[PDB]
Amino acid sequence: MDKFCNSTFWDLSLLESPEADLPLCFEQTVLVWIPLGFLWLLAPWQLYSVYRSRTKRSSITKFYLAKQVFVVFLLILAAIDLSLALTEDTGQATVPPVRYTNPILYLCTWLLVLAVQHSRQWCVRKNSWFLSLFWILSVLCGVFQFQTLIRALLKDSKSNMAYSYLFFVSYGFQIVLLILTAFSGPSDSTQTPSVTASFLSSITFSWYDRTVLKGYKHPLTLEDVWDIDEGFKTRSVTSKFEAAMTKDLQKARQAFQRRLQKSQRTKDYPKSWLIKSLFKTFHVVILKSFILKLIHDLLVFLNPQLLKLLIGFVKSSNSYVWFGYICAILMFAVTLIQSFCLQSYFQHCFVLGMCVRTTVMSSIYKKALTLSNLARKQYTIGETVNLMSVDSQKLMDATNYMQLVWSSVIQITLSIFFLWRELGPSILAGVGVMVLLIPVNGVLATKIRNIQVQNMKNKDKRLKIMNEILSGIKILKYFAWEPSFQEQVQGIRKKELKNLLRFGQLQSLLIFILQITPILVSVVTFSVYVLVDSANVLNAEKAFTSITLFNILRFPLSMLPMVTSSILQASVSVDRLERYLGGDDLDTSAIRRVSNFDKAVKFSEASFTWDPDLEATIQDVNLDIKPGQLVAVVGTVGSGKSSLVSAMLGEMENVHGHITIQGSTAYVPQQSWIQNGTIKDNILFGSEYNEKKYQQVLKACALLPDLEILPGGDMAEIGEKGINLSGGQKQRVSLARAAYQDADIYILDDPLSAVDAHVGKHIFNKVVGPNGLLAGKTRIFVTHGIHFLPQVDEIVVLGKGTILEKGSYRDLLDKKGVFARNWKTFMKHASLAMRRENSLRRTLSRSSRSSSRRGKSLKVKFSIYLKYLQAVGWWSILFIILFYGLNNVAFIGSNLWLSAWTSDSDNLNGTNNSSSHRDMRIGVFGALGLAQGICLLISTLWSIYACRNASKALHGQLLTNILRAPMRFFDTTPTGRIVNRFSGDISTVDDLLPQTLRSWMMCFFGIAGTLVMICMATPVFAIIIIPLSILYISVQVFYVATSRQLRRLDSVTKSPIYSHFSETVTGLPIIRAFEHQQRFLAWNEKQIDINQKCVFSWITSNRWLAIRLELVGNLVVFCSALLLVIYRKTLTGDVVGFVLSNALNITQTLNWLVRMTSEAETNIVAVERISEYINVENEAPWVTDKRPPADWPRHGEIQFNNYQVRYRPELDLVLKGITCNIKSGEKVGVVGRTGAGKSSLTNCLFRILESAGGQIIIDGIDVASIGLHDLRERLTIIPQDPILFSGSLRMNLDPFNKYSDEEVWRALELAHLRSFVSGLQLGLLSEVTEGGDNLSIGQRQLLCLGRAVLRKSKILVLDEATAAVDLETDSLIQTTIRKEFSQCTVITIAHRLHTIMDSDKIMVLDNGKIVEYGSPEELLSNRGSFYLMAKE
């Protein structure tokens, strides 16, 4: 067959030459039969599989014509080649038989290509794997022919200019076709591009390349992320799952039933069916992921072998040059292909995890709607929504880590094999270190978790103290108490800081072990290797290929414990879920919803029970209600009327009889149920909107006054924001919803409980009365009132679960049997915050085991960074940076030394075999490893102490400044916001931020060390890191910008699923009664899909990132390999080893660095907010220059001078120049219009509001010229609303401990708390809960006045809140104030006139100005505004 080209084809010796080109005939035979063979062996299948497809869908577009035209051009070239071959046949006497076989072949093939590119018009995926891969393969195989011909043409050998030139042009067209087939075509109608993108643009996730730009320009919104395709929609996956489940569930139910009946002749449930059902429904994706993972696990072990070949080549100086370029190119190609396989495996695996979580949440919801009440009472609503919110997450985590449990053992076994095959049985020393460091990592992780839990408890205590400080800041300002509470929260914070330091030290040990495992394993392996034998030499190939294999081995061997832990947690999660879904549905045998019947409601001989073991709550019942027949059942409390209602709907288990119901029911429960949303949405309750009926039912049910009181009217949002409607509004809203629903039977069940009498009668008359809106509808009332009965249609009295009698009210008042007796007698008739946070703690402490591999599974202005770094210190971060740079320099030195230890095998100069030399080598290698370890410990421990100092200082400043901010700041800012800055931002600064910054430093220095090694070998590489740096910088910028918003959107969308599930499982009787299950199913599926698209877009963002980063690391490896092949005449094999076994470890560090840059951007906003509250404006100085004469109020003489005060510097004066005077000892009341300036007086004597004009002078000293605390301590107050600080009676009465126990007891006896306080066990140290739960209201203000009396100043400003307190309390207050504060100036602010005439003086204050002065005796003679207001 050699004659086919008149020249030899399989020579194999032309390669054995410096400039070694392939033989032409070999090329034109096999490098042409490979692509054409691929095209022909599969094309009939592609055509046979496409021409049985959907509509022609032959939209004639621009790529389709471009590709057809280029293939036509190229067919024309093939025909021209045939013509020239025949023309040469007319010339020479002999022609190779292939000179026409090759062109003819192309002719046929291109027709086929023209018939495949047209075929694509029928499919949705235009450019598929087949034709795209054929173009790749053809362009790849033709480069050999290209290079041969061009090299021969520069020789000007005159062989054939025409053949060579037509080949050049045909190859150009094949390049343009490959490019034009990579491009995803002109996308059709607005589908997600995941299913219209070409093969290459879908392998590299380059169809996501426009979401990333779009998210970088302006932030993404829920309408900027494309919908997930229809195969993942909740309805689709749940339908598939239920088809695959029903059979397994039934089989397990049969097994459980047979087991129970065998036992009998709750700890058993139909079990071991969920995991089989999930595999039987997702097995195709399981296989796809399995095969992709297998291919990647086999491809991982080619790069060490190519590295071995390249070291060997650079060593042997008599080798060819075409070998080594081939090895560098193969390193690039293998890393590219394994990147594609791995990223596609992640996409499959993570989307399968998402689909498993989706189908499980949807199954949970579908089951909660039909769970038997007997099985529904076992759980709690918090625990059920927990079953949705943690169990499905655990099952998703197991689904992600499911393929690692065998992939990691394949990788471990192959790595042990390939390490053995190089370094003999002394590999087990290194692998033994690697394995033996697993229990140590576990021990450190356990101690970390214990410290974290104790810290969490201590943090919650501090947070509760802070919350009671902030919510009662007014009193704390009054009595000058911020130093005491400052010290208390400082003590708790000091405890938390010590725990944080211990956490830090263990984290440091964990980091040191993580970063020193590789150097220690290599020193142990090489020492044990070179020692155990004399003829056991260590050369560059063994040393550096074994180092590469150790870096491959150490990742699976460390992730294996966490994978097994995740599987074992998901096992118990599966048991919990599988127990929920197996519980039998509620039975509807007893209650039948027929369509036609004689009576609307018919109870036939029925008894019903909550729990069959006990006696029936409702006994035998025989009754019938015809349409329109209003019935008002009445009975003793606990008789079962509420139970009768509950049984009618179906919320009871039948013990006997049955019930017939026709039409649609409407339920008004005793327990009110209001969904999250607006009053209008609740009233409509998912029904058609009609303004006539809507306004009629608002008017009838008397909501209009409530809407007028409420801010938004019928648009106010209930729940999740907080309106907490009083029982009247809730009950009216429920009744309005029922009335608007327009049902057939209305089961009114005590709908006038929390309602006033007259409004209740109005509601009865215009809602359920005979003239009400519900005249024609059967309406069963459940009454605790009587006055409605004289006009109700019919009465059924109930007792002991049985009807005593039924009749009209006339019969009730006439028959005088049980009728009159009943008529006479009836007159006298949180859970998630501590658990949902636990799963976040677990998945953040388990995915924080990055180990430079944070691709395992994942979950701003420079001034802010400068603020944090200024807090942590500047010398500290200088020495942290320096002592990690020393670590990296020692690592570079260690590699350089190993390169000079493997080198003494080549230069076997006699002296490189003595035992002293080997001892020196292994000793200095160990010393370099030890120096690296010491530098790392110093750096990390210093980092921990410095970052602890930063956290301490930041919290100190924030708390010292918040406690000293004028009351306007606390009025204009929600307490929730400040507490949230003290809770989740001090925590971020404490825990997450230091480790994120430290890890960023470690990644940066690892990269810099690798790059300086590469550039130390071949310095030209310092120029190929200016474009690589630009590519990497652009990648991280785009990825972090987009991923931040995707994570935010996912978090925003996740919560509504659980909120809606909790609202469904809470108000289930109402949903079932209105017959609204399908609407709620649809809503839950909609919310799940809206979340699903965000989480899927996040997954794809991660894959986009990973492809780009593996490309950057691949280009580093490939460029260094090329520069070490090119420059081989000046370097050695050892340099190749240590340059190229490190560049292989540059993609993991790049992934880690991008992830940590994103994390630092996310976390530093905590410092942003903390620094925002550090700078909040402060009050006046507490102590400025002056002191009192040991007692500033001598007798309480207060003088005003046209005082003018403003609430906020941009507003109008509330006081407009008051000029009055109070002498020593008089009692002054102040009066006026509502909002005329009452509050400002008691708010301005304490300087809480600074003067805008005028001044107040006490005892000849102006208020504005003394320190704020100095003045504020010397007065006295009884605040408007008594706030009690949780703790001890001693602290509440006296936190400063300045008052002795004897006088505290004397003041408490003056306040007369001996009966209540002395009777307590501890006495004056009795615990005080958060205000209430003890110390009755009267005790509360009596304690407040005790505080006032032990303060015992000469000035008593006070005001009254409400008269709800017992009159004895007010009388005691006034008597005490008059008996022990008689000789003290008193100012009272009262809006109740009846307690003011007793005052020695009254000030009249309207519109912020005085009206009259003098005593009430001096007033009442006149008839001024005081008279116009008093006694009326």
Curated annotation (Swiss-Prot):
Q: Which residues bind ATP 2?
A: 1232-1239
Q: Where is this region: Disordered?
A: 836-858
List all topological domains (Extracellular). 1-26, 89-92, 147-164, 299-324, 423-425, 530-551, 891-931, 1017, 1131-1132
Q: In which tissues is it expressed?
A: Mainly expressed in the liver.
Chain ranges on the Cytoplasmic side, renumbered to this chain:
48-67, 114-125, 186-277, 346-401, 447-508, 573-869, 953-995, 1039-1109, 1154-1432
Do you know which InterPro entries this protein is assigned to? AAA+_ATPase, ABC1_TM_dom, ABC1_TM_sf, ABC_transporter-like_ATP-bd, ABC_transporter-like_CS, ABC_transporter_C-like, MRP, P-loop_NTPase
Q: Where is the ABC transporter domain?
A: 601-825, 1198-1432
**Alphabetized NCBIfam families for the sequence:** MRP_assoc_pro (TIGR00957)
Q: Which disease is it linked to?
A: Defects in Abcc2 are a cause of hereditary conjugated hyperbilirubinemia (EHBR).
By what name is this protein known? ATP-binding cassette sub-family C member 2
Q: Which gene encodes it?
A: Abcc2
